[PDB]
């Protein structure tokens, strides 16, 4: 979702150690900026793809329904 | 024709020449290896070991395989000269802690199932 | 230009394999048999090369299974039998080839379940 | 010719008339999902998993049962086909129990795999599930019928392949159940196969329960030695232990099945095993010793004597390599007393001609004959897969079967001519109606069991059968290459031993009692110490403690058939080889290696040092032993028949009685099966129901 | 079709196809094939002799300007007569694009070193030599990079065993580290995992 | 645990043990399975 | 010196075995009735060549090639082996 | 239900105990053999049999999602109790 956050890219001009150190410090500041944006815009919903042939089902479903148990077995073996 | 391309040598003569140059270099280097690594073996032992390694691949009749073997031998010599190898690496050629295994049928029958 | 080698391909001196695991090994080139517990045939399409089984013994401390041969798990996949044969030959391994087993076509007739005068009529459904 | 053109996804295919949609799909490499269809069973069409859409047709068809039509375009991956598959899978899984972690089928389940590949990934079933009560059908097949999906594969196999109509369905609707409706054991020589055909964990192996998962197992493709059929098998092993035995498909021999002994006798190998060399101490008791000491004692005893004073007896599970090694070793001593326990007539041609002692029609050839005569044999228990082939021919080709001997149950209807051997002469003189029947048979077969050659008049019986085959060949002429004459063997080692020149029977030992006797896995008790002089030196080499070991002075532990790569020759004459699955236990060694080491200790060192060199020696002695699937050979019936009519010994007035009259005499026949606890359970179950 | 399925981009697919045709047109002597994957990755299969020209073109062409070599590795497919597959991944910052260049070799055929085109190749080729045994001609300094000194074999080949042939320990009699044949207290357990039922009909092969 | 006691079970240890490494009570590993292959026992009576 | 067994390896449809085949088709039986206690093992070769094997006391044996022989040639060599010569 | 062996070695619930001739016993000298004292077979045998008034019962091991997968057990056999394949709990119908 990196197209939905705002931040700047630090750029050096000397190509030496000092400029790269300044760039890393500025990148830490930009990371704090992005973290703020991510904290404010966290949406609700599921956290893995709703496709049990890829992502394992929930434990409650695995102990309740036949297809969920089959897919859990096959995805973990 | 079989249409194959060379590595370095055109036929077996040039390959043998490269083999002889590599052997000369290793033979010259052996005493320096004995001195620098502080080995308890003699120079004669090292040169016999060098001779033994060459003899192992004596049977090969393909110039490309010989060329690759010479490249590997030069790499090994470079590792030895620069002391990138340690004493353990040099002594690994001698298999000093491996118990001898008999090649006779009776000895193998007695110890286990392996042929 | 080219040199036109007239020898047989042989790379054993360059593979780093110890001599014992070259001359004393027997490889098997075969199409694996279908597992009889299932009807799927997708595991009977490719050729397999595998090594001869060596000794396994129980570990004294935990009773685990211990081996001393490094090729006990090596299995190679090939598109054709000729490819596997060429690989085995250039690696210096002596091999045994088994021809592919294909189930023969069968004549199925659902109507034969109810024959007027043959023994193929079924007593139950 | 008559081929019609259909289309699979637009790709043109030419098929024979009567080909189904599923087979047309198979031709281009597309496997249709299935649950009830089996290509060796009758078409059922009840599971409905094989529904596929035909282009320009509104109704899906059952691919397993519907013949193709000219110009049809089968759409295997269309929306209609996929929706049908998902619906059928949903219906199948609605009442299925959540048993995968405790189900032995897990990991090799057709239900699981086809749900993963063609079903949905979730459930919308919001009701309770059905539960059915379990059934007891014996100690071999474990039954959990809540997992049943009612494909009726087991019923069709039991009726069609095994000839037993004990299985069926009771009730109807959602309450229909597969079973016997009464407490009754489904006991057959081929019963265990219903474990393989069952697509789910409803039927499982009881000895195998809870011990392994399919992804753990390592598979070794080898051969069975429990009879002379030479069934191809897969050996499942895990962490150095044999876990189970499965069938391996060979269309010419067993083609999907194994007998129950072949499937469940693996248990015997885990007990009563010889692991260390043994000698006799000061008190006459067997005591463990090293290989060097035992080999030195045997070598000294062998250097002491020469010629007729040395002899050997080969058992029923010996391989060709060890047989040829022992033959060479005893030949170096100038001994020719190399014998087998199984008796074959030696007069006339004897072992000189291979066709004299082979099943010349081959197992596949049974599918082409119209009349088969069975003489003094019980094919059901001696060769269960051969009897299964006979039943296949009886069911599908209207084969006519007649038997001379005791009226055994063969799972198919046959004509019983009688049990006296005089009937043979009556058919040889033309004074029998069945002689007329054989005269009008254009593809006749006559099969004589090896067990009938064990009586004193076996030579006369063989001569009479040869006379019958002669009259068939003379009256009906020569039909090309049909090979009417046939011999059915029951011992896995017999044909290789006959090929190598071993003397059939043990009579030579009786006539010249040796002072040194070699028992190569001989456990038939044919010769005890009463038949031998006192202070006779007896050496036993084998893998099991049985009849032969307690009477031996020195014990040499050998390898079992699962522990070596070894050659075995079929009753057809086909040579096959086993593969190493596990190594021999303890200090046991390969048998030919033991013989070669002994030869080197004794001073007469054998030339061969590796397995390949021993097989080169085998090729030197009999070149057919290194052709590993060839079954074709020359026919010398005329010479053998001519040589068989110069000896005119007479028949005996004793009925021909097979050694195994009922199922209880089937489970324990050899050293491995006698040590099996599963076979003991089977014997206890068949002798008393309870 | 919407929520769980990855969306596809057709503009990038068209652009990559056009550029693949462009490269194939400019260099017919070496280009054997061009492909665009359905997740929008462009590959060009070439004859080995064109390793240096093609790369140079891609690096210096005004319309290509692939001036960064992201990665260079090998793949081993034993069933092929030419065992080893050489893969170059290139990135163009000017046009914000990526391209893949593929060629092949066997055990005895050298591949020309591309250090003159990309400096980054220097170590990558060394790694390919160490792990697969592919020799690069005119390499400034070719030797092992990852394996231990004096190590024998090329471990990334399919026929090389997972645990190798030798193992190390300390010996007190010789007072040094020594190498011996591998012995494992617990053997690695091979798992047979593949399902006997076909998963992807779109990739089915003809029955020969 | 004073205000929120744990659930009582008949198999939970009633006496906590600390780390016992370096002591006689220390854990020693061993195989928990029975013997796999059973050997033949020769008869105890003479054979002649 | 003391003959123990005779082994004849003849191929099924190779031309070079034809004469040997003819012998077995015509004059094997008589030989069997002349030596009724002598093992004469008839086996089949692969595509290489015909062969006759003669085994003697104490494990000694030698082989003679029967390639392209006629029936008369194989009878001659067989009775040479059975008699105390060669 | 831990019992002792002739050498005094404690027997595990799987039934393992070294024989007298076995040298591996030396590993327990000056140390101890770890044995779990709670034999699950006896503990599950101690549980009472539930009686229910239906031909089919359902078991999930207790605690809902904290138990095992839910399975259905048939109780038609009068001379036998239905046993859960996960838990070991037993169910039956009222008789006599
Ligand atoms: S039969 Fe298959 S789907 Fe049913 S419980 Fe067993 S493994 Fe699972
Ligand atoms: S028991 Fe198995 S084979 Fe028989 S009907 Fe049920 S699912 Fe089919
Ligand atoms: S496979 Fe066709 S209906 Fe079952
Ligand atoms: Mg099953
Ligand atoms: Zn429960």
UniProtKB/TrEMBL annotation, chain A:
Signal peptide bounds: none
UniProt subunit comment: Core subunit of respiratory chain NADH dehydrogenase (Complex I) which is composed of 45 different subunits. Component of the iron-sulfur (IP) fragment of the enzyme. Interacts with NDUFAF3. Interacts with NDUFAF7. Interacts with CERS2.
Family per similarity comment: Belongs to the complex I 49 kDa subunit family.
Protein name (Swiss-Prot/TrEMBL): NADH dehydrogenase [ubiquinone] iron-sulfur protein 2, mitochondrial
TrEMBL record, chain D:
Cellular component, GO annotation: mitochondrial inner membrane; respiratory chain complex I
Listed name of the protein: NADH-ubiquinone oxidoreductase 75 kDa subunit, mitochondrial
Binding of [2Fe-2S] cluster 1, residues: 35-37, 47-48, 50, 64
Location relative to the cell: Mitochondrion inner membrane
Binding residue positions for Mg(2+) 10: 200
Binding site for [2Fe-2S] cluster 2: 36-37, 46-47
Molecular-function GO term, any one: oxidoreductase activity, acting on NAD(P)H
Principal EC category: translocase
Binding site for Mg(2+) 12: 203
Binding site for [4Fe-4S] cluster 1: 96
Binding site for Mg(2+) 9: 198, 200
Principal location listed in the UniProt entry: mitochondrion
Alphabetically ordered keywords of this record: 2Fe-2S, 4Fe-4S, Acetylation, Electron transport, Iron, Iron-sulfur, Membrane, Metal-binding, Mitochondrion, Mitochondrion inner membrane, NAD, Oxidoreductase, Respiratory chain, Transit peptide, Translocase, Transport, Ubiquinone
Family according to the record: Belongs to the complex I 75 kDa subunit family.
Automatic annotation (TrEMBL), chain F:
Top-level taxon of origin: Eukaryota
Subcellular localization: Mitochondrion inner membrane
Transmembrane segments: none
Function: Accessory subunit of the mitochondrial membrane respiratory chain NADH dehydrogenase (Complex I), that is believed not to be involved in catalysis. Complex I functions in the transfer of electrons from NADH to the respiratory chain. The immediate electron acceptor for the enzyme is believed to be ubiquinone.
Stated family: Belongs to the complex I NDUFA12 subunit family.
Binding partners and assembly: Complex I is composed of 45 different subunits.
UniProt protein name: NADH dehydrogenase [ubiquinone] 1 alpha subcomplex subunit 12
From TrEMBL, chain H:
Membrane protein topology class: Peripheral membrane protein
The protein's role, per its UniProt record: Accessory subunit of the mitochondrial membrane respiratory chain NADH dehydrogenase (Complex I), that is believed not to be involved in catalysis. Complex I functions in the transfer of electrons from NADH to the respiratory chain. The immediate electron acceptor for the enzyme is believed to be ubiquinone.
Main location, first listed in the record: mitochondrion
Biological process per Gene Ontology, one example term: reproductive system development
Natural source organism: Sus scrofa (Pig)
Positions annotated to bind Zn(2+): 59, 68, 84, 87
Family note: Belongs to the complex I NDUFS6 subunit family.
Any one annotated GO CC term: mitochondrial inner membrane
Claim: Electron transport is one of the keywords in the record: yes
Record has Repressor as a keyword: no
Shown part of the complete sequence: 28 to 123 of 123
Alphabetically ordered keywords of this record: Electron transport, Membrane, Metal-binding, Mitochondrion, Mitochondrion inner membrane, Respiratory chain, Transit peptide, Transport, Zinc
Localization per Swiss-Prot or TrEMBL: Mitochondrion inner membrane
Protein name (database record): NADH dehydrogenase [ubiquinone] iron-sulfur protein 6, mitochondrial
Domain Zinc finger CHCC-type: 55-91
Subunit structure: Mammalian complex I is composed of 45 different subunits. This is a component of the iron-sulfur (IP) fragment of the enzyme.
